Amino acid sequence: VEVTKKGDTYYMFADKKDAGKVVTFETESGPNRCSIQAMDIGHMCPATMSYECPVLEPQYEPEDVDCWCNSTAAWIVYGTCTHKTTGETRRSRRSITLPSH
Amino acid sequence: VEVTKKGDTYYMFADKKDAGKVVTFETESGPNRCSIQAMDIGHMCPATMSYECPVLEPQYEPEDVDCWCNSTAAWIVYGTCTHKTTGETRRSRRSITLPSH
Amino acid sequence: SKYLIKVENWILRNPGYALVAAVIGWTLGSSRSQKIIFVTLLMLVAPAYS
Amino acid sequence: SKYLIKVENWILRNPGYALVAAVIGWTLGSSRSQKIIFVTLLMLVAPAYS
Amino acid sequence: SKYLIKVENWILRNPGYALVAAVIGWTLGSSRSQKIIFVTLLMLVAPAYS
Amino acid sequence: VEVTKKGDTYYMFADKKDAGKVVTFETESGPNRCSIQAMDIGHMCPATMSYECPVLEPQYEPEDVDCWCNSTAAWIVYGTCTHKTTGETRRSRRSITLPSH
Amino acid sequence: IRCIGIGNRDFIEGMSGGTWVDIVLEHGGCVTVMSNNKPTLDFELVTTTASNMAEVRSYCYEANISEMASDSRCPTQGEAYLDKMADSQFVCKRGYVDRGWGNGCGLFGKGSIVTCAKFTCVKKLTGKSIQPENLEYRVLVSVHASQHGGMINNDTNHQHDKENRARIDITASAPRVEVELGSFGSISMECEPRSGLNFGDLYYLTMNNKHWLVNRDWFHDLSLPWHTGATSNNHHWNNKEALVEFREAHAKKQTAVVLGSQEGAVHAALAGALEAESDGHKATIYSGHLKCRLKLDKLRLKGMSYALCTGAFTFARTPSETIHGTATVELQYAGEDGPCKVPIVITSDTNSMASTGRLITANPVVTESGANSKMMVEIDPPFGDSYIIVGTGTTKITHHWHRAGSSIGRAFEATMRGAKRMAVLGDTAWDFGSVGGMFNSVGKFVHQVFGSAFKALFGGMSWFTQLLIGFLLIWMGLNARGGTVAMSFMGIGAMLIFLATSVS
Amino acid sequence: IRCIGIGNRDFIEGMSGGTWVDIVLEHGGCVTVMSNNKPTLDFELVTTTASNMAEVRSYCYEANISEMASDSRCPTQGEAYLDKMADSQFVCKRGYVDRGWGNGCGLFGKGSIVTCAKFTCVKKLTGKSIQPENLEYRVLVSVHASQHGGMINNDTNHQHDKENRARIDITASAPRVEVELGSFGSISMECEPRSGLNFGDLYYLTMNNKHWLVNRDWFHDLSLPWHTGATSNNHHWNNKEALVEFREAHAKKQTAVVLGSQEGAVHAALAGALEAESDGHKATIYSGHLKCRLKLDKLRLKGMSYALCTGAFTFARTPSETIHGTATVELQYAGEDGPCKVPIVITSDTNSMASTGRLITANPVVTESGANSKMMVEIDPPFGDSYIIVGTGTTKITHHWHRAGSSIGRAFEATMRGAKRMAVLGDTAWDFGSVGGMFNSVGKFVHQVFGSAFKALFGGMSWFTQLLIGFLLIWMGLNARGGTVAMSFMGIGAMLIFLATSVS
Amino acid sequence: IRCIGIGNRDFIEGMSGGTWVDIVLEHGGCVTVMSNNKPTLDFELVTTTASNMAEVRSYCYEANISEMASDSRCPTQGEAYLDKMADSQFVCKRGYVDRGWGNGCGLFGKGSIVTCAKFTCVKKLTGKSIQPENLEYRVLVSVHASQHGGMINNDTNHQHDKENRARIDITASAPRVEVELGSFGSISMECEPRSGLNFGDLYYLTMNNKHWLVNRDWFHDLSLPWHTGATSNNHHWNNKEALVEFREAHAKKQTAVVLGSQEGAVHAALAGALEAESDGHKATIYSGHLKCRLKLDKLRLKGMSYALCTGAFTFARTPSETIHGTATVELQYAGEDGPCKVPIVITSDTNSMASTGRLITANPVVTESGANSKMMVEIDPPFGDSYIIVGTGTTKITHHWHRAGSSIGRAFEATMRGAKRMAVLGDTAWDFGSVGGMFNSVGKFVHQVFGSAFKALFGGMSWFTQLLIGFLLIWMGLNARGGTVAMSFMGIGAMLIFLATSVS
Ligand SMILES: *[C@@H]1O[C@H](CO)[C@@H](O)[C@H](O)[C@H]1NC(C)=O
Ligand SMILES: *[C@@H]1O[C@H](CO)[C@@H](O)[C@H](O)[C@H]1NC(C)=O
Ligand SMILES: *[C@@H]1O[C@H](CO)[C@@H](O)[C@H](O)[C@H]1NC(C)=O
């Protein structure tokens, strides 16, 4: 995965292949091993989901969390689409109805 | 992971540790390499989610599937609870309301 | 009930003498209702001569 | 239908003679309805002189 | 209030003498209202003889 | 599977055992490898489903087709019954109702 | 004796000189016919028989399918075609399905797909019609011959003397039948199967060795495959799509399925239906009445010329009583005198010795010449208390009997029943042909409607006083100048004169 | 003495010769019954007890799940099937999900998916019904025996003389009870639990060792799983889908979840509900009144035959005053004379020595024979100023007392209260059975409605002048020919004669 | 000749000296204008054209999303913040979610989460308004010049002689137009686009190269993203949350999704809507009538000075008959005489030779000088039987014709139609300005309402007898002293005198 810093904050460009595996990078404090458990991760495409995942103490196990690192809070970002066809999932099935007349 | 057969169907008892890795076992057809991408997998406890995951051709990418093997369809089962405290996640937040009086 | 059927059968057995007695007692009353009472009297005393 | 249109067109062709005949036959009836019958008679005999 | 209860209790203690005095003072007035004033006078002077 | 030709058209008698596997035969053009992905295939019995499955170019993926060969269009036929008990599935569950009186 | 234990029992009496007499038979009742010199007869209708019924339509509840085939063509190819379309045993459906490069051809449009399969009816039910010429009624005729009255002879195998009982099959082909009762004589019967249950709006449904009756307007409303009645090994069916369900839509094929056994649906729908029974191909119906006319010309008695019994008569048990106020007496005779007439009288006191009632069985007689024999008779005791005396001399036995009710009540009930019967006999009651039978017809029906009250009311049947009463009533009605008083009085007088002229 | 500190206090007085008397008890009040020769009694209703209540329905707020399983079939395969579907403990839901080559099979169509899981109720609440035959009321009876009046005996362990206090359990099975008060005597009570709070539209809800009462039309409206009304270790639940939430959809599975503890929702919904308490399986209700009838035949006094006190009487403190204008006096007696009657008088001046008021406690007496003993009494002072004198001789003590208000005001208030009470006693007030108690009933209720004013109004209760006034009023009403003036006057005269005939 | 095959056809005739004449044109009909010396004209309205329509609002049915971001803060941290909140192209939603040690921070409470994402409209539909100044009507004008009447010239490319047909575009800017018909002359037209279909409650909806009309009281009711009409590359949208469905908030994120194509929903909602067509940016409407006033001053004939035809006339086929009782005759002329006048007469008998009917086409003439040429004419035969004669000398041909109906019936129908037309012409019928045109206006409309009956009724149009009838009627109405009999009679007399003064 790509690791960059824009304005004193670390961005981790993770593609689809690196799904369910940890990665180690370097910060101003030192080495940081950060695990990623993204379940809805997709291929690389303009539709990019980005969310900060926070630092936590080792003793407390994660719960309903799919990203965690231990140096600081790290912002993760990854694409969300199907088979690199430049198309989002858009599976909402709301089926909004309009008045007849 | 444990691999058993009860009534001509294969059950794969997978614990929490084997999460995100493939496993190879033997069937009547031959060797079978089966990959597991279970996202909601938990520790071992009575609450056990079990679902058949099907065989498919290697020339297709998995879509909305977190388990696939290539000999036949294999039934996977795994516990779903937190920190082995014999407690489910039960994070529904439905907050059903009742009439006052 | 117990006596009506008996007097009825008696009337139906010999209706001539019964009608004779009835027409005799019909003309021995001062009023119409009195004649009716006199003929029902004959009707009642008909089964037993005594 | 077959004859009404013919006599109507005849009346509309020469209305002067038709009105003359009508006013002549109007004063030759004893009653109002009789005058009406006499003028409709003239109306009907108008197309064919014969 | 302070005197009404006293005279009321006095009337209720010996009502015979009170009614005697009332009927005596009733016939000692020139007008109806004057009789009422005379009997209320007796009612008021009743508790204390002095 | 048996491969015959009656009136310039090829019939492939496929039993239950050959389910989910390809087969190679010979035609007037040459060798033909034809794949069969029949899911509801059954044992041999009078109830026989038969449908032509068409030739297509290998540079396209199949979209709604479970049988495809590359010499010509091939007619496939196979029985549809349960456990060779001479009985069809007949699982319609229509439950047609009749007027009372 | 077949008419004793019947709830719906009637009594028919004809004129003394009147040979012909009309009756009505109900499927749940009986008819007793008596006369002055003729023996009592008992008519009953057992079963309505339907045979040789034609077939109208047959439905198929459970069916099978086989050899399902389909054919699909994508745009720029036209309609799909299959060789099995022209066959009447194969049903197909057409449709339009979306196609593309994944289905074989290039152009992006929807095509035409057709799918047919065979149809074989494994189980079926049938519907038959009922015609009036197919019906056949069965009537049993019994004769009061002082029989033992034992119920040990249920079937028709034996223990049925052919001179005491008989069976008659009334058909629509020949309604005129001649009945032979052996020594008793012969009678004639003309029965008209009319005014019965309507059979123009009923269908006889046969299904799974069971049978029902259904409505014609409902039989055609059923939504199932059907075919008319044609003798053949393979039949053409119509509207079979109601039993074969096709899937939604598939690009290259379509898999049809067949419905399961619809026996439960038919059993649930036929809950409120009438049922019947069948033997082989014939059916039995228990509903329907009948009208008949009997000619009794050669019918006579059997023991009219016999002598009296000089033996010993004894009761076999306490005489029973039926719902119609009739008393059955079972006698045992000791002695060897041969067939002799049974001297029996009904009176009011032991010293009176005067006949006060009538007998339902005419000429009671003993049948065998054995030493200790038995016999039975049926009589009608008068209202109130009475004494039945059997035998003569110092060996005659007496028995007390009581019967509740009133003579006027029974008379009015019998008059109302006779009026209802004459109202049921709407047609074929009178004859408007040759003259001479019109007066006979009016007299016959006025007798059959008023004799039950005439016998109960007008005294002791002296036949002499009643004539004088009729004469004086005619005279009183004649010497009256007022209207509406002479016509009715003369009519009543003539009615009474005629009713006294007949048998009492 | 249990009726002293009560806000809702009444006063009931019966006829001198009238043994029976009716009363009404409220769950928040008290009743004082007094007579001329009988000791004062004090009745109170403590708690309504409900026991042996049947169970109707139980709801489950907090539940758990386990063994979630799912099964998916794509088109041309039919509905999905699972072996756990036939089990009553496993709940499943069906659905249709989009499938493709990525999920295993090729044909693109919506497939059938089914998903079920076990259901176990970890915590639940219960609902019980209340029947009239289950209710049981508890009434305490106290006797004014000049007790010390100390509040040191709260429970029922000791310090409760069995001849001074008693408890009675009124049940629907036997409403007739016989109460023994020891030396005082015995009384009879017949109480009818009628016109109380309706228990046909109320359910007793038990939840988390707490209890409430709810409406029957609302109890069935609640949306939670529920079982049939039977006692079983495991019962077939119904409508459990309301506690198991299924996800939207997935191409191969479906993960169900269970809701959390719904205790907060129930606690919020039951905010405006009534509460109660329970012990073991019995429940306590604090709402509901009662009607009773007392028979006082064998009840007598205890110190009527005692002598006078020749010792020293002294006040223990300033006499207090209650809300009902009653004065409690606490006396201390010095000397050893044994149980002796307490000479106490109420007058208007120290030299008058004339009884002007009545006593709420009849026959004040000292209970022990000790040297320095104590006692208490309760009296009703007259309106205005008064003097209470205790003792005789040169050692008698006097005390001033004042009471505001008016005699007419108290009379009118008591009359209105008696009218309200008689209106509450709608049924079971009179008896329409045997004759002789109807006049007794009309006299009894006219007394109970008018005696409070009769005693307050008609002078000093001389019993001699009132009879003369009644006689003269009867005479004035008799010599009057006008209508509507003789009937009312004679009625009022008879009423006054009867009220003077009773106790004053 | 464009007005022959039209169901809704009228007939307008003006005064002889009256140059101005008013007419009404319907979008589904035609108007024929004839005069005494002027050639017959035929006016039709083809299409209503709407151009340069302004835009009011635009909706977005199908949309896409990208760059979804979220931010969550748990208690003791305040509200969540994101830099993309201030941007108008990013939509976010706020919410509160339960937090704990499992989610990152310590305190056990619920926090604030916000989530926004970009919004890009890939496909959209538009709404336009319609103003009266944008409408433009198109009217075609044809001239009866004895044309061949062949329908081979559909478009406007060729085969349209510019002196026989013309097109006119009536706009709201300049309602006064001058029409040039070449050799025939020039006319003037003033049309007022009033009393048409209301365009204040209609919106022109453009969607997917299709067009509809909708109600304003429903267009604003639709629940979809929208934005007003502003010329820009990037537009600000409002109420876009209706197309983006947010998933239930997770522990620390929120995944939004976008809805699919809503084209099917709009197509289903617009089922009962009116449709239209469009070319480029202009729209075509087929509903709406028009009122016009024609000034015919410089219009003349073309073949008035020509000579007679001395050739051979022949029928080309059996003369047809239209729904309005008009007869079209198609003639073929042989010979080379150049353009010559066609001698045609209509009479009642071959020997009578008297004009009994009128001609719809004035001055029938041959157009070319060819040897064998063809032409067409349209006439109105009299009710009943008639003879059409063509040519002179021994070569003239005759033909029989018949027409049903009655003259009075046609007169009454035409009078009622004229009354309806005058009622439609509510405004702009008369002029209340300068005096001298008011009498002209009243005469003009009384003529246009009564001339159809005047010509049909009053004899053979002798022009001499009618004046005498009018004079005698005026005299009869004058010598009458009674009220309500002189005014009406004098008015009718003056009306008849004026109608006879005009053209018959
Ligand atoms: C993060 O945790 C890993 C776990 O092994 C450790 O190696 C690494 O040094 C940690 N980084 C820190 C504490 O900055
Ligand atoms: C399943 O796929 C793996 C992929 O390496 C292969 O090694 C294995 O032989 C396959 N099993 C079969 C074909 O039965
Ligand atoms: C079908 O495709 C296979 C691909 O390996 C090829 O070997 C075979 O020759 C083809 N059959 C033909 C072209 O008939």
Author numbering:
A (entry chain H), B (entry chain B), F (entry chain E): 1 to 101
C (entry chain F), D (entry chain I), E (entry chain C): 120 to 169
G (entry chain D), H (entry chain A), I (entry chain G): 1 to 504
Sentences from the paper on this structure:
The pr domain of prM binds to E, obscuring the fusion peptide and thereby preventing unproductive fusion within the already infected cell. When immature virions reach the low-pH environment of the trans-Golgi network (TGN), the trimeric prM3E3 spikes rearrange into the flat-lying conformation, characteristic of the mature virus.
We obtained a 4.2 Å resolution map of the prM3E3 trimer and 3.8 Å resolution for monomeric prM1E1 composing the trimeric spikes. Within the context of the spike, three copies of prM1E1 form an asymmetric trimer (i.e., not following C3-symmetry), in which the three pr domains sitting at the tips of E come together and interact. Our data resolve how the furin recognition site on pr interacts with neighboring E and thus is sequestered in the trimeric spike and how prM is anchored to E via a strictly conserved and mutation-sensitive histidine. E and prM are anchored in the viral membrane via their respective membrane-associated regions. We suggest that occlusion of the furin site within immature trimers is a critical adaptation for the virus because otherwise high levels of virus expression within an infected cell, combined with high local concentrations of furin recognition motifs on a viral surface could lead to some cleavage events in the ER or early Golgi. Finally, we suggest that the immature conformation of the prM-E complex is under strain and protonation of His101 of the prM linker (SPOV numbering) in the trans-Golgi leads to release of E, allowing relaxation into the flat-lying conformation.
